[PDB]
Design a binder for this molecule. Structure first.
Ligand SMILES: O=C(CCNCc1ccc(-c2ccccc2)c(Cl)c1)NCCC(=O)Nc1cccc(C(=O)O)c1
Ligand SMILES: O=C(CCNCc1ccc(-c2ccccc2)c(Cl)c1)NCCC(=O)Nc1cccc(C(=O)O)c1
Lengths: 325, 324
């Protein structure tokens, strides 16, 4: 079978906490009356949720309301417990209330108000400094949630709220987040395709916080190279081929051999043979103002097949790429 | 009642954006308390417990104040004030804000402070020492007043003295508030013995001058070795203790000036009292701490009329401090 693995940091933080902290299945959820909130407009729609801008009628303050389709009560309890555990953490979306509409009985989460900057406009105006600044803000959120024994498992641009006018950032949608327990085998069907770590694609279940650092690297690559997404897979098998076209196939075999991973036969006629590419290959006239030797060295240290070889969020915060923030 | 406003730093908050003073909208962020290990208890209060602690990541001593979340509004107020005042002369420095993962109880992390043996401090402190530390408190008050904040709980328990390093900090900003001209404040602030007459007569439009009354109470207890100086047994009796020294004539002049309605519960306890000479409180055990300059300075702090008290900046110019 595959060789076991464990996080290099915050390995036993949940082991040493009482069960109430991490046993979300036993967590008792309480909610108030949604009659105190009026929905204003839709902000987003997903598979198991709809997010709205809303107003609390009792204090005239804007909030965000996430209405949850109750596909699994277990999943609702998990997201709520994680949000309650992380509440007030740096750049973590703040859960302000939990409510239920009296007639539909549909539960909803109420968050601090957030104001998303026009993304298409943001993507063209962000400078080299802005990218470093916001990447550092994401790292504060990741180091905090990892220190709190939680993996986000869905780091991607859609799950990062930037209010550029206020230089404010929040890491949002904790619906896929999970508690880290050393040796635990997790479901690999997490994260969104372009942001999936190679551990998920090769079906290595004993992953950890380092999965978030791979997804973060994917976001950094897309921002500095102006290539969205950076690894453009068309399916989950093709996603690994897109990564191998950059990192090369030699190091992919070194990774699967190190953890004694059995590579799915469906990869046999699509993976091919690929040399390790230089990150400088992705520099072009449209992105060269965002690229520097520090950015490429930092990117190289995130985008590694070996999950244990990636920088932790705390190590990443010490990188020279952030010396100006 | 007749409205009143501060003689100094009157509009400092009016002229600053809402983000500075609007604590209810202040977004609090905290780290993981897992990086701190508690060493010993330093004090216990109604809504907090203070510990000496160690940051395990750098092996540096700090102080950790664990807050009982009686009101989130009160927590936001103390945090915003501490963040606004951070680095101010003799103001306790807020170094971090954390939360214990399991209890979810928020805690404030301060620079390390080392309180000198208090029982030893009283008899060892000289006339110079009292002038030196009084001046250190005044630097902190002039700074926080200039920053549009009144402490509202000046008392010995809220002054940290590290005598070996001649270091002072004004601590526990849990009752502090932003000054806005014309605002009516809750009079149920400060500790009984340090309450200004404005609070005792229920005059809500008070200002930074409340801190100068409390400071005067501390000065009187130090130079005369009478702890506390105005020993009230309840909030009504507290005003009678002040009147036994300042006299009832000037108390009526004060309430008439601001058209204050005196609570009927004072009727059969206030009595009639002459204005006393400060020299009356001098004795063999305290005469080495008293001087004409000390009594003149004390007289200028302990006045009924909040507008007639020295400001922290005026107090720093007094001859009592010519040696510091
Ligand atoms: O789609 C979005 C976010 C969209 N962000 C776009 C975006 C994110 C990051 C960057 C960036 C990253 C690194 C460096 C520099 C820049 C950029 Cl350029 C754009 N939001 C709309 C929907 C929404 O706000 N949802 C929401 C809000 C609050 C809570 C929840 C929740 O599920 O808890 C959901
Ligand atoms: O009780 C105390 C302080 C106790 N000070 C006693 C004291 C204070 C003033 C003088 C003095 C006044 C005028 C002239 C000369 C001297 C003297 Cl003689 C003694 N501290 C123990 C607990 C503690 O340190 N609390 C603390 C520390 C840091 C921050 C906080 C906080 O709430 O932020 C609280």
């Amino acid at each position: 079978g595959p060789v076991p693995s464990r996080a290099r940091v915050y390995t036993d933080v949940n082991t040493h906490r009482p069960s109430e902290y991490w046993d979300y299945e036993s967590h008792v959820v309480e909610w108030g009356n949604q009659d105190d909130y009026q929905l204003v407009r839709k902000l987003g729609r997903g598979k198991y949720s709809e997010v709205f801008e809303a107003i609390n009628i009792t204090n005239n303050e804007k909030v965000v309301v996430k209405i949850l389709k109750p596909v699994k009560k277990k999943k609702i309890k998990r997201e709520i417990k994680i949000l309650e555990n992380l509440r007030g953490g740096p750049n973590i979306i703040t859960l302000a209330d939990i409510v239920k509409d009296p007639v539909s009985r549909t539960p909803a989460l109420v968050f601090e108000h957030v104001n998303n900057t026009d993304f298409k406009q943001l993507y063209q105006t962000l400078t080299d400094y802005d990218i470093r600044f916001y990447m550092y803000e994401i790292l504060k959120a990741l180091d905090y949630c990892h220190s709190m024994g939680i993996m986000h498992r869905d780091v991607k641009p859609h799950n990062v709220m930037i209010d550029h006018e206020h230089r404010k950032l929040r890491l949002i949608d904790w619906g896929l987040a999970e508690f880290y327990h050393p040796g635990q085998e997790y479901n690999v069907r997490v994260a969104s395709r372009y942001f999936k770590g190679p551990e998920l694609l090769v079906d290595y279940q004993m992953y950890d916080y380092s999965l978030d650092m791979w997804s973060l690297g994917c976001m950094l690559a897309s921002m500095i190279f102006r290539k969205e997404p950076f690894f453009h897979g068309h399916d989950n098998y093709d996603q690994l081929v897109r990564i191998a076209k950059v990192l090369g196939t030699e190091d992919l075999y070194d990774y699967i051999d190190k953890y004694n991973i059995e590579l799915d036969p469906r990869f046999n006629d699509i993976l091919g043979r690929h040399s390790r590419k230089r990150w400088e290959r992705f520099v072009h006239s449209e992105n060269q103002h965002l690229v520097s030797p520090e950015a490429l060295d930092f990117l190289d240290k995130l985008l590694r097949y070996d999950h244990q070889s990636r920088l932790t969020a705390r190590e990443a915060m010490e990188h020279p790429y952030f010396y100006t923030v």
